[PDB]
């Protein structure tokens, strides 16, 4: 929306105006059910819960939730599309090797079923990870839904709502990769830059100005590490000639006009960056957390980028609000994909 | 700024209570002379200025400074210890290929002379860089003064005065290495941890809780990069078994008790960190700058650590206050080096 600080409210509203179907494989997980209850009450999405119908209904009753009577519940052991989904899974895993017998096992795994629902067009997005490892969430996602065209990996971005309104869009920047890839290749780093810029435009209403960060600015501190960022910058520009991407540059050159004017003259990014691309996961994971904690920024994420259809992974330590927000964001990813 | 001011007053007081000799090789640089004037008025340190005596006196008179009459001024071209210092430089560097001829050239260089004064024990520390490159300041420092016992490398730390008083010491943490080493070895990273902990005690009166940072916490995300931090943690503990150092851990595990309880139970650091050790310069240089800019934190530094006697390097764009502060910090480092 017009102010970057109001983005979460805008995300919720956008979801409400165009209701999407979101699958929650963790249909008995309490925080997930609490979130689903509020989401359904607020008309944000149409919820699909995975689990034994009697078990799920009993859990809803046990937690005292009142807004989930009209939620779709699908039992992985018994539902109308079970054989169809089994055959689809076999088709996908035919070359790598999957027998009918163990396809029949896997289709009853809620995480696999969830991905097959989305892949089949019977839902618009999936969220899990409140009671599953990231690895266990991502494995069926990458096996069944897969990465989007051109993308060889997925990455995680955060909305960083900072108290420095003079930077980004009223203090908001997107930053990546903060979750997935330990040490991106130049090619992987270029993918991250393009994906994060696309996410920024599509979901956050930001006109991207993408800074490829380094301890060097435009050859000030040459090093093999610096070379990787330089190459990633060139590769990202080739991938997406429409985007404003520049690098390599230090964090102060990215944000501060005075510094940019000296260290990166004429740059279309330096001094007004609103998307920060970190060279490694050590940088990404440490830096966003320190900006959050030491800077009192609000960090919303991780938002997964590069999947062929919207899949997000929650922290196992997530709050109910975290789930509510990430479901709304998942819906916005789906809406964006449909409008483009 | 307001965030830094109380600790900085403590640094100044500690300097005043145990006066050290600080060499200023840039004895004609105006900001340096303004700083030296206030430092001498406040009895923070004993200043040694390097330059032609008549040139320095003329400059002081031109600027109208009134507190520098008793400052020691040493002319590199003409002073009674010139031969002694030349021979010391040769003793240190002759095996590295320094000739007597070239030693006699270098002793006339104020940065080399300054380092030779310190190395001789005729001063306690040195600051420069208002009108010299970092490279030119550090070269004689590393050649002549060299690294402290157990250190074979130096690093740059910042006092990061954050607006999050619930973390570190009323919002203050020391963070390193933010300046020097692109990709520390496990050994170099261990040295950073120990050096930064010692700097934290010496300068900030902090009881160190040192977090060796990673994208992993205690084996949550195993990787070659994670392995390096794990090894650095073990090596740091071996170097200084007295210090409270733990890792590998994520930044949230370092700072947040609730997260520490889940991800690093029983840690002697997690949830209480006041010193953050970054695994690479990409991490260090990006992270402190983003906390400064996006977080409105005040970053005082870089402070160079690991030297046998303190040498610090100012920005060429530094303020008078920057110089005053860094001299006081250098003095506190000198006090620590003498213990």
Numbering used by the authors:
A (entry chain B): -3 to 336
B (entry chain A): -3 to 335
Paper text:
Porphyromonas gingivalis, a black-pigmented Gram-negative rod-type bacterium, is a keystone pathogen linked to the onset and progression of periodontitis. In many bacteria, the enzymes phosphotransacetylase (Pta, EC 2.3.1.8) and acetate kinase (Ack, EC 2.7.2.1) form a key pathway for production of ATP from excess acetyl coenzyme A (acetyl-CoA). Pta produces acetyl phosphate (AcP) from acetyl-CoA, and AcP is subsequently converted to acetate by Ack, with the concomitant production of ATP through substrate-level phosphorylation. In the current study, recombinant Pta (PgPta) and Ack (PgAck) from P. gingivalis ATCC 33277, encoded by pta (PGN_1179) and ack (PGN_1178), respectively, were prepared and enzymatically characterized.
Structural and mutational analyses suggest that Pta is a dimer with two substrate-binding sites in each subunit. Six amino acid residues (Arg89, Arg135, Asp309, Ser311, Arg312, and Asp318) positioned at the cleft and the acetyl-CoA binding site were mutated and recombinant proteins were prepared to investigate their contributions to catalytic activity. The polypeptide region in which Asp309, Ser311, and Arg312 are located forms part of the side of the cleft on the domain I side, with Ser311 and Arg312 positioned at the edge of the cleft, and Asp309 located near the bottom of the cleft. Mutation of these residues resulted in the complete loss of enzyme activity. Finally, Asp318 is located at the edge of the cleft on the opposite side from the observed acetyl-CoA binding site. The D318A mutant displayed only 11% of the specific activity of the WT enzyme.
